[PDB]
Amino acid sequence: LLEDRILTTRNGHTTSTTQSSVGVTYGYATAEDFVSGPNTSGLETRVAQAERFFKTHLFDWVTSDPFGRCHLLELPTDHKGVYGYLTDSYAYMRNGWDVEVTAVGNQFNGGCLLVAMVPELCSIQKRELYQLTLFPHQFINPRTNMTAHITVPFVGVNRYDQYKVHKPWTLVVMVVAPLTVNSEGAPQIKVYANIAPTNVHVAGEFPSKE
Amino acid sequence: LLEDRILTTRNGHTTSTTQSSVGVTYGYATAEDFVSGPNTSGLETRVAQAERFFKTHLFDWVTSDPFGRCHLLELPTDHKGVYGYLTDSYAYMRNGWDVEVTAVGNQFNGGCLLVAMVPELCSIQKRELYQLTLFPHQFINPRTNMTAHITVPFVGVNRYDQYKVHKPWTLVVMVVAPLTVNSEGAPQIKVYANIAPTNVHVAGEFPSKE
Amino acid sequence: SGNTGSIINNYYMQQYQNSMDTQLGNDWFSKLASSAFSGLFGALLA
Amino acid sequence: SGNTGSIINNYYMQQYQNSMDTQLGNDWFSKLASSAFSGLFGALLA
Amino acid sequence: TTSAGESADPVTATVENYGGETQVQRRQHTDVSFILDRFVKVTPKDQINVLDLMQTPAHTLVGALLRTATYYFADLEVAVKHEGNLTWVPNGAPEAALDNTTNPTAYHKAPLTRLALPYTAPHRVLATVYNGRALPTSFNYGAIKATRVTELLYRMKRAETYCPRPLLAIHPDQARHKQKIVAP
Amino acid sequence: GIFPVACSDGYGGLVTTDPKTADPAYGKVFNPPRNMLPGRFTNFLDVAEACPTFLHFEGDVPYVTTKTDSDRVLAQFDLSLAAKHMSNTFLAGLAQYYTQYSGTINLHFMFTGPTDAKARYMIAYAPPGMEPPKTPEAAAHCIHAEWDTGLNSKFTFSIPYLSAADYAYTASDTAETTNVQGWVCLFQITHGKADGDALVVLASAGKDFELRLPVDARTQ
């Protein structure tokens, strides 16, 4: 019912589609820092096999749900498949979370969540929450989009980041505008999150569980 | 509110229009078998005068109305005008039902009827009802279309079919998905049917009522 | 026409095995099969 | 393929006797047989 | 491969989409003319048997496939393990017509009868379903009679139907129908 | 050795039509001469077409006398070879042997009465779906034609080949009393001192005519 806009994004074998598209946005970068560094002394390889989508749940955007609820989700994070085993068999590596965020209600509600993908951190000041508009981020509103999407690069502090004890990437969605069921609108919107780790290479290796 | 699609179809003087168009589909054929056959020995002529639209009623797609109600409508069938008088003054002939099927509710309901135009038959097995997807047919859904349309050719078993006692063409619309009034949706959808007999020629002739 | 792998003219003349199909003056199902797009109504990514 | 000394096309068509070996895209034992030296690791005399 | 669905324009999809390649299939077997040329042994009901097709078991290969395409054309190759002399008679020809030796009155040997059969309908085409248990008296490929016929088989030939019909099978119960195949 | 062979079962068991020929065991026979011998022919739809025949009728006579009442219909019957009047004629005295047919057949008319007997006739042809008329008035709505006695006597009208299937049978049943091919029906306009005259109708094969599928089955 418009200028018309659709889109499917393939990562390995996994492919998220959508219709309330709106587009996307890459921030900070669009590339990747020469991952043929000195510290990895040629001892690094491409494993674009675990490069794809996995599901994890954000909060539940509810009418009450105040002007701040911004369910965080660190990236990296628990992986019951590939990328996870990789982090358990490896010390040094680096990637780039794709991230294609959905939040289903319908084209009748009010309010907006604020999607953003920010690096190194610890915790944020509420007074600062008024500037996610500074790091890779999207804006959701059921009257145009149902999907978000924003594809993040690699920042790390180093070329080949270690994750056993460090997580450079964090994902927040503060409720910028509270939700309104309304007359005929939907009842509730569970914000679902679809992620994927891209252009990633490893270096390093430990013994085994034995 | 989209890619935008409208359409009006003229047959003689009668012209059905629509806006929820979706398109159409011709099946089996697109032509017509050389109607200059031997059995008609030049004794056949074109009467594209009765070639046009007439109205007849299908069932009433109601919420309850089970997953099968497929109100049939044989084609040929009772004609209070031209084409009918033609069949009463003639023995041998052949045409091609246009058929532009509507079913008005609005863009808010659920469910779908299954429109199809199949030839020689007698009756169908329910277990078979899962394959109308084999003969000239359309699919209705109020969230895209309000109209169907599918234009059928001539099949008959012969070149010049007789209808006093035979009707090669039948029209069914089994409810594939039951109807849901819903919150603000419409209350009921009376499936209306608009038909027209095309590329038809006669041959033969009887005395008169006297 | 099914299983006719004879190397000869099946002996008996043409106008004898089957009945000759006089003319006048998958045909179609292949016509509506060989035309199904595997495209995307949006635009591929990644 | 064993004992096929027929002078004809064994009548019945090609795609009929045996099943056609579709391709893709002593083989080896002859490869490691035809390479055994009868030489001498020293030098012949007399 | 999304698309508009209430349009029913054929809109398939294939491998490549999310990955993988697509192969070179050799469907030679699902060739309609090929898999209809192979005899069907229908019950030769007595002696005076009509070369019909809806007599055949609507569950056999040549039967089923038969009952799946409304229109059709083809010739015939029969078989008759039997007694006496098979004296076939064309279409339309008087029931009684089949008796005179002058007619094609084959002479017994050992053991059945393999002969060719033209498609002899006055109609340019025939069908398993005439909307006109209740199907036309010109729908017969001739008619045979001997003096005791034990085996009736019809190898349909130069096959070619038109238009389609519904194909279903063995209603399972466990979402997977189990039946002993061929094991070592 | 020698060429192997598959003594195939079922191929060769005598057929009353078998395509091949038998063996000759006398040979070297020089016959008499068959030069330009009178009235030959080699096709029965050649003499059928080429030399018509009259029709048997009520009573038996071929002709027909001018009705002098409202009852005009001079003829009327089943348009098929079973037609009694035809069943004896040359074209009918053979279509017996062929299950089906198609084509056109002809109906030749003639007068025999005085010159003081000027008369008018009609020829209607209705099809399957209704019963034939009895009033040229109601009949003038089929595919017909009108004519009146003159200098030239004869006249041959060709009746049309109309049927669903390009064919249909020569035989018939008490199922076909609705005939798959029509009830041709001839009538009688008006006339003058031309009552009781002779309008004999014959029958030949029109050019459109054709006949196929040989069937032999007891006929005398």
Q: Is B74 exposed, middle or buried (0-12, 13-18, 19+ CB in 10 A)?
A: middle
Nearest chain B alpha carbon to F126 = B206
What is the least distance, in Å, from the CA of C24 to any CA of chain E?
11
Sequence spans of domains, chain F: 1-220
Interface check C7 vs D, CB under 8 A: yes
Q: What domains can be seen in chain D, in order of their start residue?
A: 1-46 (4.10.90.10)
Contact present, B137 and E173 (Cβ < 8 Å)? no
Q: What phi-psi label fits residue A80: left (phi over 0), alpha (psi between -120 and 50 degrees) or beta?
A: alpha
Q: Is B39 exposed, middle or buried (0-12, 13-18, 19+ CB in 10 A)?
A: buried
Tell me which residue in E96, E109, E124 faces F13 most closely, judged by beta carbons: E109
Q: Report the C-alpha gap between B147 and B11 in whole angstroms.
A: 17
What is the least distance, in Å, from the CA of C40 to any CA of chain A?
7
**Touching partners of E (3+ C-beta pairs < 8 Å):** A, B, C, F
Second CATH level (architecture) for the domain F1-220: Sandwich (2.60)
Q: Report the C-alpha gap between E183 and F108 in whole angstroms.
A: 78
What is the least distance, in Å, from the CA of A4 to any CA of chain B?
7
Task: List A residues 4-43 in contact with E (Cβ-Cβ < 8 A).
Answer: 6, 8, 10, 12-15, 17, 19
Q: Which residues of chain E make contact with C29, given a CB cutoff of 8 A?
A: 164
Q: Which residues of chain F make contact with E91, given a CB cutoff of 8 A?
A: 99-100, 213
Interface check C5 vs D, CB under 8 A: yes
Strand positions, DSSP E, B47-203: 54-61, 74-75, 92-94, 100-103, 112-118, 137-139, 169-177, 189-195, 201-203
Tell which residue, A171, A190, A169, A170, has the closest CA to residue A179.
Answer: A190
Nearest chain A alpha carbon to E15 = A13
Tell which residue, F183, F81, F46, F207, has the closest CA to residue F125.
Answer: F183
Tell me which residue in E2, E10, E162 faces C40 most closely, judged by beta carbons: E2
Tell me which residue in B2, B3, B183 faces A184 most closely, judged by beta carbons: B183
Q: Report the C-alpha gap between A132 and A115 in whole angstroms.
A: 8
Interface check E126 vs F, CB under 8 A: no
Burial E157-168, CB ≥16 within 10 A → b, else e:
bbbbbbbbbbee
Interface of C with A (CB under 8 A): 40-46
* E132·B28 Cβ contact <8 A: no
Q: Report the C-alpha gap between B71 and F137 in whole angstroms.
A: 44
- Domain of B9: which CATH number? 2.60.120.20
Look at the block and give the residue holding tokens 């946005």.
Answer: A25
Contact present, E129 and B121 (Cβ < 8 Å)? yes
Q: Which residues of chain A make contact with B3, given a CB cutoff of 8 A?
A: 4
Query: Helix H segments across A76-170?
Result: 82-89
* Pairing mode of beta strands F98-102, F210-214: antiparallel
Nearest chain C alpha carbon to A96 = C46
- Triad C34, C37, C39: Cα angle to 5°: 160
Q: Classify E139 as helix, strand or coil.
A: coil
CA distances from F17 to C17, C43, E107, F21, F91 (A): 13, 70, 12, 10, 25
Q: Report the C-alpha gap between B140 and B100 in whole angstroms.
A: 12
DSSP string for residues in E55-96: TS-TTSHHHHTGGGSSEEEEEEEEE--BSS--B-B-SSS-GG
Beta bridge partners of E41: E153
- The domain defined by E1-184 folds into Jelly Rolls (2.60.120)
Q: Which residues of chain E make contact with A13, given a CB cutoff of 8 A?
A: 18-19
**Rg of chain C taking only CA atoms, in angstroms:** 22
* B3·A4 Cβ contact <8 A: yes
Q: Which 8-state DSSP code applies to residue A197? A: B
Interface check C16 vs F, CB under 8 A: yes
* C24·B34 Cβ contact <8 A: yes
3-state secondary structure B53-74: CEEEEEEEECCCCCCCCCCCCE
Tell which residue, F103, F29, E99, F13, has the closest CA to residue B38.
Answer: F103
Tell which residue, E137, E41, E50, E125, has the closest CA to residue E88.
Answer: E50
Q: Report the C-alpha gap between A193 and A173 in whole angstroms.
A: 11
Q: Report the C-alpha gap between A95 and A50 in whole angstroms.
A: 11
Q: Which residues of chain C make contact with D16, given a CB cutoff of 8 A?
A: 5
Residue type, F164: A
Number of domains present in the structure of chain A: 1
Range of the domain at B122: 1-210
* E2·A6 Cβ contact <8 A: yes
CA distances from E144 to E117, E118, E139, F17 (A): 11, 14, 14, 16
Task: List B residues 87-126 in contact with F (Cβ-Cβ < 8 A).
Answer: 91-92
